[PDB]
Design a protein around this nucleic acid. Structure first.
Lengths: 224, 177, 218, 437, 246
RNA sequence: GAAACUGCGAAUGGCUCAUUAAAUCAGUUAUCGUUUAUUUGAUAGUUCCUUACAUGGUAUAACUGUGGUAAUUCUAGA
RNA sequence: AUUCAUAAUAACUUUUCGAAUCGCAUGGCCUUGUGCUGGCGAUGGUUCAUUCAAAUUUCUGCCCUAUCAACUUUCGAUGGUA
């Protein structure tokens, strides 16, 4: 019996498991005035300016100093591709929540700008993301889970056609998070990879189904 | 009834002060517990703060300490003999502080026998005691001054009257008889 | 008067009006807590034995035990007494209450049946009403069912079938005072917390003693 | 049935007594349903897939259960036959039900009693609720002195009075007052107020004190001192967790020094009588049974604690009796040495209690030697106390005792200071002498 | 009155709160706490009238029940908690630590503070004593009882306290030539080195202080608060460094 | 989530100046002469000691029902 | 400045306290027991300190009146002891 008849007060308690059980993933089910899709001088730069206004944390302030000297325009991003990404990955591995929100948003939008050239950073981006999510298990925060899995949904959505072409490597990456021994990790990672599965056409889908059935027979002992 | 303010007395110069307020609760008094000798019976009074205070109406036993030996025994109080404030208290057997009661002596002489290997009446330097104390032991009752406030704590604790006080109160008893 | 008679074994109760004065004179001079005779009351109460339990006089002022004065009186009632319910903490109202000795002016005398007579009275002896609720403590359920100490209670909770339209639905109490893994963990935490704090205190005291002895050996 | 039966037992009071005694005996009696068990069959297979949706799991479980039944048809036939035959096991509280019935009907048990006294003399195992109900029945008994075995009931009654549960003490005092005699009828309220917890010490100083008002007379003392000693034994077995209980125990042993010499000896005889020493002294120094248990060592520890307190309050005037004081002491310390030698260093609780018993035994030995010394004989038991000295100690007495004056050391010093007590030094090959050296 | 007051009028309030005299009748009576009544800043005054992070008392409730405010390492949720002098108030989402310390003009002063300086807190050892079971303790100027202090700590001596463990890191004696902050009286906020303790018996010990422009004044030992040595304040002083001018 | 038990508050606030002439009050002191809910910081292994701690026992409210009275924030019996 | 803080001794007590309470979660273990352990935080509780207080309290300061010069003490007025 979850909370069915809402009360008259305004601030419920909402324990962490209740917040996760309420949580879902699809931002396309969601919608708002998306700032990065709304203003278009540069996606990364627009989101960067909004987050420079909104966020006041030490880690994001230092990141803002460095990359604010670097990026102000699209050829600057396209040239300094590696430096930006390594600084982003450095602070995400620093693992600080107050700064963990904007860096995840910027990772999504940075891929959106750097589209079909992101496929060389893409692997260790996913690696740092799943390390972040297991750290979030260690510090329970529904906020961090929602942000990180929305970043994964955005990366899948932005690099649809290439990961769809190469679907088996993506699930080979996400199996440490798909078969993870926590109900919500398996739930959210399955929802994101489920969006990609819905996007995939019939032939690569047949290959992926054959591969995942072979992998399930490999994980005969695993039920999760 | 009782209150203990200083606004209803005469002035220091000898004037009569007119009234300033109604009586206040923080200047209350309570009715004295004329604690007598009988079976143990004790009220509890709730006092400022939430603090308990035990009044004794009748109390039989008590804790009396031998100061020269530094020990303490629980004895039975016989009756009040002398009291420096009111011989009506002496008459009515009221137990208050600074009263002079006679107590039982059997636990003290039992401790003395078991501690010094010697009876009383009829390590020798340690065994030697005072002459009037030995006379009281032979009599069967000991003189003891009460030093507790049995209307406040509900305990009658005292000390056995040692040499100089015993001399003074013996003169007092013999002169007042 | 009117006799409010109650059979506590069935939890049943009824009222019988009384007009002739002979049974009233039987009731005279008796007090609350005494006994009377149903045969001396009337015919249908042959064998029954009552007990004067309470009543109200002709204006409403109820009977109160303790006061042996067959009149009305003004008592200073307190927190924990009958015939008075205080509206505010430490309040002592003074109320008019009727004494306990049964006189003539009682509008209602209320009796309880101690011993059943020989004939079945209509409302009292025949029918009954069940208890409203079952036990709520775990040991109360173990008593009321005679359950052994090795047996569990959550399988023997008493349920009630409620219905609203077509959705049949059951209800059952939360068994207060029931031993759980939760309470076991809480007791364990109290123990471990006391132990941890005592260890920290001994450690800090030993460190201060070391510092002090170092100062003195300096 | 509880209010119906007291009106209808009068018709046939014999059969109802047979039923009541049968219900008393029934929880102790065995029950077996050892049915016919056929040979085991290994008929089992995962007939369906295991699913994750729960209602499919439930239907698959139902079908697999029916399949397992029909595959092991034989054992399932037997189990279904049993489960439809239905139970016959008496629920355990039926003894409590029959004891409540017997409590409501005191006169039939009072008439018979030849079938209930075995439970009393076997001392029940029954629970404390049933014990209290049965002792309430014994209080309700009317012709109590004319029961089947009156004095043996009296003995077990006095033991249950000496027990430490004050409720049990109240019940046993009520039954002993049901035993009627004018001395206890005179002092009837006094013992009840002694059992009362609030009036306890005030009552003690009220009428147990010698040479005062309301004191016990001489013949009444002779007839009543068993009762007072049993109730004082219970109040002394009260354990000292807090200041109030410590003060109660101290009050008991500090009013002990005024009774009389054989009454002090009888109290201490009780305290030793709970233990045993006839093992050693039916042997010489060998223990028959290896009773190295926590139960018997905690009995010895309670004994030596009450002996220490009694000596500290009776430093010179107490009686020593060889049959009640000295023999259980050397039994205690020999048992301490025995458990220390016999069982390993894994038993931390038993070894720690053994060390505490050794400490307190040597402490009371040194205390009693300091306290009586030359005032009574020793030649009866010189050899035994010397044996319980010389087994574990003199081999490493210098290696152990070199830091402080030990209790054993101070006992040696008292031995060497007093002339008649040279016999122990004389008794060995001056082993304790060379130990001092 | 027949009991303790619960209301504070607007003009009855302490002056240094800078509460304007038209926005109502009542000023946030600061609840009982570590600091005294006439020298405490409630969190509602601090967050609303000073930082302008809130516009209403309902917004101060929203902030505190969101659990952002921490006063000396611990979360507070009572909006009239008496945050006093030498306090550390950390706002995490804003990434700021504030040492509460007086200004030269006699008012409290926001002092932006970094993490390594916010990690500790001074405290004026004010009552050194021997407690139950024979342990010694010190009572500083904010109620903090610290058992087992250094044996040389005396009355009126500053102790630097590590916050996250409540422990004494080190201490600063009361001798002539130390740097002294003045907290009460006319000159409060004037940081100056202490020259001479004029000591009377049964009266009040005055203290002659002389500050960096070599100006001399006198206060009492109750208002004196030792900071550090000559030219080495353990804390970072506000702007102007406590100098009263023309 | 009604009701009722429990906890806290109702001793603050608001109004008025009748009384009171070293009284109140103002400034200055003292408590080494006392109580203090709350807030804040610290604080309590006592191991054993002779014959349930996987956690003792009673009730009572609200409620069901029977009533009284011209009437009140009246209440009685079960 | 103390008979202070604190400690120790001997007893005393219609005698206190030393958690039979509550929310979220579910991790570490393994003798695979429904066994052992474990996080965050709510209420409470002995003492001590702190704070909001409270009650007493020291000095000095009140308008008109001498056609008001003596006043207070049985009935406490001033001090001493209990």
């Amino acid at each position: 019996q979850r909370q069915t008849t809402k009360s008259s007060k305004r601030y419920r308690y909402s324990s962490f498991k209740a917040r996760i059980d309420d949580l879902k993933i699809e931002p396309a089910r969601n919608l708002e005035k998306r700032v990065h899709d709304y203003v278009e001088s540069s996606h990364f730069l627009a989101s960067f300016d909004q987050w420079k206004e909104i966020n006041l944390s030490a880690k994001f302030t230092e990141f803002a100093a460095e990359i604010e000297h670097d990026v102000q325009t699209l050829p600057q991003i396209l040239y300094h591709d590696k430096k930006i990404f390594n600084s982003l990955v450095s602070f995400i591995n620093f693992h600080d929540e107050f700064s963990l929100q904007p860096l995840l948003d910027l990772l999504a939008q940075f891929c959106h700008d750097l589209g079909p050239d992101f496929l060389k950073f893409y692997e260790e981006a996913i690696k740092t993301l799943i390390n972040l999510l297991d750290a979030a298990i260690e510090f329970e925060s529904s906020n961090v889970f929602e942000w990180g899995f929305n970043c994964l949904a955005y990366i899948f959505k932005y690099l649809s056609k290439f990961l769809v072409k190469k679907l088996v490597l993506t699930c080979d990456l996400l199996i440490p998070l798909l078969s993870h021994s926590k109900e919500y990790l398996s739930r959210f990672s399955a929802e994101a990879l489920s969006f990609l599965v819905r996007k995939c056409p019939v032939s690569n889908l047949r290959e992926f189904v054959r591969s995942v059935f072979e992998k399930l027979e490999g994980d005969d002992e695993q039920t999760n | 009834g009782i209150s203990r303010d200083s606004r209803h007395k005469r002035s220091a110069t000898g004037a009569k002060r007119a009234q300033f307020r109604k009586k206040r609760k923080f200047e209350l008094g309570r009715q004295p517990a004329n604690t007598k000798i009988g079976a143990k019976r004790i009220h509890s009074v709730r006092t400022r703060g939430g603090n308990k205070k035990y009044r004794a109406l009748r109390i039989e036993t008590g804790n009396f300490s031998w100061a020269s030996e530094g020990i303490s025994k629980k004895t039975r109080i016989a009756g009040v003999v002398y009291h420096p404030s009111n011989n009506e208290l002496v008459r009515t057997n009221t137990l208050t502080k600074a009263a002079i009661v006679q107590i039982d002596a059997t636990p003290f002489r039992q401790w003395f026998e078991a501690h010094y290997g010697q009876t009383l009446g009829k390590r020798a330097a340690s065994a030697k005691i005072e002459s009037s104390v030995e006379s009281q032991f032979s009599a069967g009752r000991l003189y003891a001054c009460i030093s507790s406030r049995p209307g406040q704590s509900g305990r009658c604790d005292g000390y056995i009257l040692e040499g100089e006080e015993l001399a003074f109160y013996l003169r007092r008893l013999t002169a007042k008889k | 008067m009117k006799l409010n008679i109650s059979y506590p074994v069935n939890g049943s109760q009824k009222t019988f009006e009384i007009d002739d004065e002979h049974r009233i004179r039987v009731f005279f001079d008796k007090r609350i807590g005494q006994e009377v005779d149903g045969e001396a009351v009337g015919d249908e109460f042959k064998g029954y034995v009552f007990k004067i339990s309470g009543g109200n006089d002709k204006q409403g002022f109820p009977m109160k035990q303790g006061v042996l004065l067959p009149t009305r009186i003004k008592l200073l009632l307190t927190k924990n007494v009958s015939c008075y319910r205080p509206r505010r903490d430490g309040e002592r109202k003074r109320k008019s209450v009727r004494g306990a000795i049964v006189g003539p002016d009682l509008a209602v005398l209320a009796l309880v049946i101690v011993k059943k007579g020989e004939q079945e009275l209509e409302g009292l002896t025949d029918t009954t009403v069940p208890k409203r609720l079952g036990p709520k403590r775990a040991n109360n359920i173990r008593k009321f069912f005679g359950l052994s100490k090795e047996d569990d209670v959550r399988d023997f909770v008493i349920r009630r079938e409620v219905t609203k339209g077509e959705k049949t639905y059951t209800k059952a109490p939360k068994i207060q005072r029931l031993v759980t893994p939760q309470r076991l963990q809480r007791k364990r935490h109290q123990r471990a917390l006391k132990v941890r704090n005592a260890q920290a205190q001994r450690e800090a005291a030993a460190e201060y003693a070391q510092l002090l002895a170092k100062r003195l050996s300096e | 049935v509880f209010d119906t039966l007291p009106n209808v037992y009068t018709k046939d009071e014999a059969l109802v007594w047979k039923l009541v005694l049968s219900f008393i005996k029934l929880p102790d009696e065995n029950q077996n349903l050892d049915y016919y068990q056929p040979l085991l069959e290994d008929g089992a297979n995962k007939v369906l897939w295991d699913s994750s949706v729960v209602r499919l799991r439930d239907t698959i479980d139902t079908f697999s259960h029916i399949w397992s039944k029909y595959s092991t048809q034989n054992t399932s036939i037997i189990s279904t036959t049993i489960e439809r035959r239905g139970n016959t096991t008496y629920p355990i509280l039926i003894r409590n039900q029959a004891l409540k019935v017997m409590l409501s009907i005191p006169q039939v048990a009072e008439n018979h009693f030849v079938d209930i006294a075995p439970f009393v003399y076997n001392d029940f195992s029954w629970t404390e609720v049933d014990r209290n109900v049965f002792l309430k029945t014994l209080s309700k008994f009317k012709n109590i002195k004319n029961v089947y075995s009156a004095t043996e009931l009296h003995d077990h009654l006095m033991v249950l009075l000496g027990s430490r549960n004050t409720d049990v003490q109240k019940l046993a005092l009520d039954a002993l007052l049901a035993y009627k005699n004018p001395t206890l009828n005179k002092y009837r309220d006094n013992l009840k107020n002694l059992l009362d917890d609030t009036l306890f010490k005030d009552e003690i100083t009220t009428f147990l004190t010698e040479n005062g008002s309301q004191s016990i007379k001489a013949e009444d003392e002779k007839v009543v001192m068993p009762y007072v000693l049993r109730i004082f034994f219970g109040r002394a077995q009260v354990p000292p967790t807090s200041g109030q209980k410590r003060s109660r125990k101290i009050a008991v042993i500090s009013v002990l020094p005024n009774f009389k010499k054989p009454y002090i000896n009888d109290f201490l005889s009780l305290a030793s009588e709970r233990l045993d020493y006839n093992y050693f002294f039916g042997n010489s120094h060998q223990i028959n049974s290896s009773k190295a248990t926590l139960k018997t060592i905690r009995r010895m520890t309670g004994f030596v604690n009450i002996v220490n307190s009694t000596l500290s309050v009776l430093r010179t005037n107490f009686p020593l009796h060889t049959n009640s004081v000295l023999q259980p002491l050397i039994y205690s310390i020999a048992m301490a040495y025995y458990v220390l030698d016999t069982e390993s260093t894994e038993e931390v609780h038993l070894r720690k209690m053994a060390s505490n018993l050794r400490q307190q035994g040597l402490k009371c030995l040194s205390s009693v030697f300091e306290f009586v010394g030359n005032t009574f004989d020793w030649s009866t038991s010189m050899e035994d106390i010397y044996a319980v000295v010389v087994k574990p100690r003199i081999s490493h007495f210098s290696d152990e005792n070199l830091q402080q004056p030990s209790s054993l050391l101070r006992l040696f010093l008292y031995w060497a200071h007093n002339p008649s007590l040279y016999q122990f030094l004389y008794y060995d090959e001056f082993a304790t002498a060379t130990a001092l050296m | 009155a027949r009991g303790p007051k619960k209301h504070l009028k607007r003009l009855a309030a302490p002056h240094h709160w800078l509460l304007d005299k038209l926005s109502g009748c009542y000023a946030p009576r600061p609840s009982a706490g570590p600091h005294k009544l006439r020298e405490s800043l409630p969190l509602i005054v601090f967050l609303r009238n000073r930082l302008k992070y809130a516009l209403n008392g309902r917004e101060v409730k929203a902030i505190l029940m969101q659990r952002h405010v921490k006063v000396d390492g611990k979360v507070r949720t009572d909006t009239t908690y008496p945050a006093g002098f030498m306090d550390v108030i950390t706002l995490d989402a804003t990434n700021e630590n504030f040492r509460l310390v007086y200004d030269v003009k006699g008012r409290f002063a926001v002092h932006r503070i970094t993490d390594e300086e916010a990690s500790y807190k001074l405290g004026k050892v004010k009552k050194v004593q021997l407690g139950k079971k024979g342990v010694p303790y010190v009572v500083t100027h904010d109620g903090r009882t610290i058992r087992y202090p250094d044996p040389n700590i005396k009355v009126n001596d500053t102790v630097k306290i590590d916050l996250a463990s409540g422990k004494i890191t080190d201490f600063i004696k009361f001798d002539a030539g130390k740097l002294v902050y003045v907290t009460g009286g006319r000159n409060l906020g004037r940081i100056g080195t202490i020259v001479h303790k004029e000591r009377h018996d049964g009266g009040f010990d005055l203290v002659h202080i002389k500050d960096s422009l070599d100006n001399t004044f006198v206060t009492r030992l109750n208002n004196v608060f030792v900071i550090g040595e000559q030219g080495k304040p353990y804390i970072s002083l506000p702007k102007g460094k406590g100098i009263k001018l023309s």
